[PDB]
């Protein structure tokens, strides 16, 4: 994630093994109850798209759900591209498949930010809300 350090600078830190372990338990215990989303959001404060994909890929054994999540990402990414006539990020850049970590940090700390972590996070949360609904 991008965090404010003690000096007050916005700096990058790797997503921590602690965070990732907590996210593993969340999914394991709770599957897709309403509270999975609050946990996800809390654990992904300041996350880059790289961070978010590390979290997503830890999800094992929920194959249909994770396909629904991909569907949402693809839909949101396609609409992003259509609304951002064709360096500025594309939908695939927001989702981290085609952008580098340094590009992501570059957008996130741009003046004013191009908050790709928050955008991708919005897509994911939209996806998770649809999954949670399905398990209700």
């Amino acid at each position: 994630p991008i965090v404010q350090n003690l000096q007050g600078q916005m700096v990058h830190q790797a997503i921590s093994p602690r965070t990732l372990n907590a996210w593993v338990k969340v999914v394991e215990e709770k599957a897709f109850s309403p509270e999975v989303i609050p946990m996800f959001s809390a654990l992904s404060e300041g996350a880059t798209p790289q961070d978010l994909n590390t979290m997503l890929n830890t999800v094992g054994g929920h194959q249909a759900a994770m396909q629904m999540l991909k569907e949402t990402i693809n839909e949101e990414a396609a609409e992003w591209d259509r609304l951002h006539p064709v360096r500025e990020p594309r939908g695939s850049d927001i989702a981290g498949t085609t952008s580098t970590l340094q590009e992501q940090i570059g957008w996130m700390t741009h003046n004013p930010p191009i908050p790709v972590g928050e955008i991708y996070k919005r897509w994911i949360i939209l996806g998770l809300n649809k999954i949670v609904r399905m398990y209700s």
């Binding site: 798209p49 790289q50 978010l52 994909n53 590390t54 997503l56 890929n57 396909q67 991909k70 990402i73 693809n74 990414a77 396609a78 939908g91 695939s92 989702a95 981290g96 498949t97 085609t98």
Partner: peptide, 15 residues
């Protein structure tokens, strides 16, 4: 699409 079925999240596409 950005993500193919059974393409991990974040995986750059093979094409």
């Amino acid at each position: 699409p950005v993500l193919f079925p059974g393409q991990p999240f974040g995986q750059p596409p093979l094409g």
